[PDB]
Symmetry: C3
């Protein structure tokens, strides 16, 4: 089905934003379920609710705190999308991913995407942090892909390969940094799988996902990632683990979202220090820097 | 995408039904492809075609026999949805699942769902009966979920866990009963996987489903189940097996739907006795019973 | 969701075509990404752009060369759909598959479908040719199936089995022929899996597909095949392999579509000789031939 948004539509929204803030972003950060904390630390903050920005999808119902704060963070200047969009919310996939495209028109040349995810690996302990190395997009195998439709050769190719989705150096540079702060627990790596559904995962299901080779399940990021790469954005991101089951031979836990708690603890504080430091290793342009 | 139905819409339909029958249901039974027999045995029968009930989706084309019979069965009073709704019929998932939600507004506190399913396990012999213990919902991994949209906090949470979908005691109580009737073949248990498609399963496909860990394939129940649990309905159900292939090294059968026959035999008679007796172990409320 | 097309709609389009060309097709060939060459070799050629044919979906944007050429090839008379329709193009599945249904109304009793596919098996070497023996349709597990809706009992059953999708003799007859031309490399066989998405496959993903048991991945054919069989069309086809990755432990290739090249070489010339000869083993009717 078409992409309602019309190139002119992303143009008008890039220019407008670009004409209301004297900040020319370089990095776009997308924070998820208990990582809006990463906001505060911006320095020359400048906030625009998703409501003024002309074509931006207004955020539905939650804690509502969903705005787009512009600022400078640890040397590089960036954009912070605080409270993103998911499928389970009823959004066509070209709506959730509108953010990522205006960004590309903004100047941005890096896209770091966080998200509070599952944890389907026995080695991970709630609270950890997983360096997304790859993804398994199940909603994409079926036709639900943000690129499904005619293509705007102004943005990217028709058949972009995702083989190298998440940058390599940025991931070594992150891998290093972790060492470099003298940190207790190690920042892991694995592959992430997007499940779309609002409800949580059956023990029966949690075993296919493990079987398929995923490491942490979730309901976001794969779209924004896919359309970033389409643009030649340099992507890469972390996943903050918070749980998961595997036993029906009999258990007696479940896994709520009340547990925005897990992230709503020091998983937050940590993931902030960790991305503030990382700003310092993102190749800046200028005239070769 | 929105859920057309508006809470007021399920309200009007609960009240109307609740004002046309002097029966206050406690259990809702949903019968599938050759289990409408379970109807007859109701005692103080009262039938409403899906056509009078104001917002109820009218049943498309088949043997047409799709009505909602109210009655009393073996001690408990119940609702019998005779001939349900599936995806392959062209129904948004919020249409098939309208039944389950009016029920919850009716008073009902248990939801037993039958369905004539595949059989992907070598140990099962056509005619058996599988006690659904869990599910693998593939149409849910992609975005096709009945909860996909804004959420009516009047019904349930936003992120319900399905970890414990199908009740435990009810399943021990069923497991026992089978013994308790002195029965020839044993009532099995395994996990059920919903495939949406009207056409049947390739031998190539039948091996992923086995690989993924399913025990019996089918085209229904997972939606009604998921939205039951959302409500705090107590769910649980059986699957009446009737076939399946696994060999392309060369075979020469196929599997029709003509075979509404399998169920359209003593798989029916059996699954009736078996759910009539089971009515006797469903905790009733009153004022603690 | 309904099938917009109304039987009368496929009727009008069959009759019109049937009244503009003095050719009564027997075989329908569908060629994909670099196999339109197979066109030239028709002998009593007769071309109709997808644009005149009244209800035919007009082909979107590409090299545009998307017309339907009627002719006689190697003894049998056929229809050649040059440049098909895919999901990633934004087409409801009942649009891509309109071709296959008018054909069935044309008289056609065989449907050979080519398609330039992946290659997920280590034994295959780019350039090969895979005799599609079976399929794994992932977009069908989720609800995206061309038969999803009311059913026109004029065409086929409601629950067609696909157990025997791709004909057996035709596949032995093809298997033989390969020998019979004294050919260097052997024409393989394996099972094909349809991924819908325009973007290409993650290394993470490429391993589920291998795991699931596929041999060559792609973004087409499964729909046209499924609806052919529904009609009792005799289907069968080849896949021309052209690539694939499996290593993220670190590699450094990707896989473009620029590589319409692979097919846009002697994979084309070969796949032409090979289907021209095969015309000679397709049982013709007449009055028993
Ligand atoms: N899909 C999914 N998303 C989550 N977000 C937080 N926990 C989970 C989980 O267990 N599954
Ligand atoms: N999906 C599916 N549903 C069925 N209903 C009855 N038999 C089957 C089967 O083999 N597959
Ligand atoms: N899905 C898919 N289609 C293709 N078409 C050509 N190569 C490929 C591939 O690698 N994947």
């Amino acid at each position: 089905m078409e992409n309602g948004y019309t190139y002119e539509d992303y143009k008008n929204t890039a220019e407008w934003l670009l004409s209301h803030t004297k900040h020319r972003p370089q990095v776009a950060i997308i924070c998820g379920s208990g990582l809006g904390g990463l906001t505060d630390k911006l320095t020359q903050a400048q906030i625009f609710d998703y409501s003024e920005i002309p074509n931006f999808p207004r955020s539905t119902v939650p804690g509502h705190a969903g705005r787009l704060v512009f600022g400078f963070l640890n040397g590089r200047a960036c954009v912070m999308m605080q409270g993103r969009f998911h499928m389970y919310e009823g959004y066509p996939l070209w709506k959730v991913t509108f953010p990522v495209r205006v960004f590309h028109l903004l100047g941005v040349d890096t896209l770091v995407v966080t998200n509070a995810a599952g944890g389907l690996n026995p080695k991970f302990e709630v609270g950890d942090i997983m360096l997304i190395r790859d993804h398994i997009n199940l909603p994409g195998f079926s036709g639900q892909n943000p690129l499904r439709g005619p293509n705007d050769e102004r943005f990217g190719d028709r058949f972009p390969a995702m083989s190298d989705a998440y940058d390599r150096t940025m991931r070594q540079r992150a891998l290093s940094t972790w060492k470099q702060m003298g940190e207790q627990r190690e920042l892991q790596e694995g592959t992430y799988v997007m499940v779309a559904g609002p409800s949580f995962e059956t023990v029966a299901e949690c075993r296919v996902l493990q079987k398929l080779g995923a490491d942490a399940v979730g309901m976001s990021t794969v779209p924004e990632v896919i359309v970033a790469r389409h643009c030649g954005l340099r992507v890469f991101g972390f996943s903050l683990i918070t749980n998961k089951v595997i036993m029906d031979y009999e258990s007696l836990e479940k896994a709520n979202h009340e547990e925005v708690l897990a992230a709503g603890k020091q998983a937050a504080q940590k993931l902030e220090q960790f991305v503030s430091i990382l700003m310092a290793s993102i190749p800046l342009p200028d005239k070769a820097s």
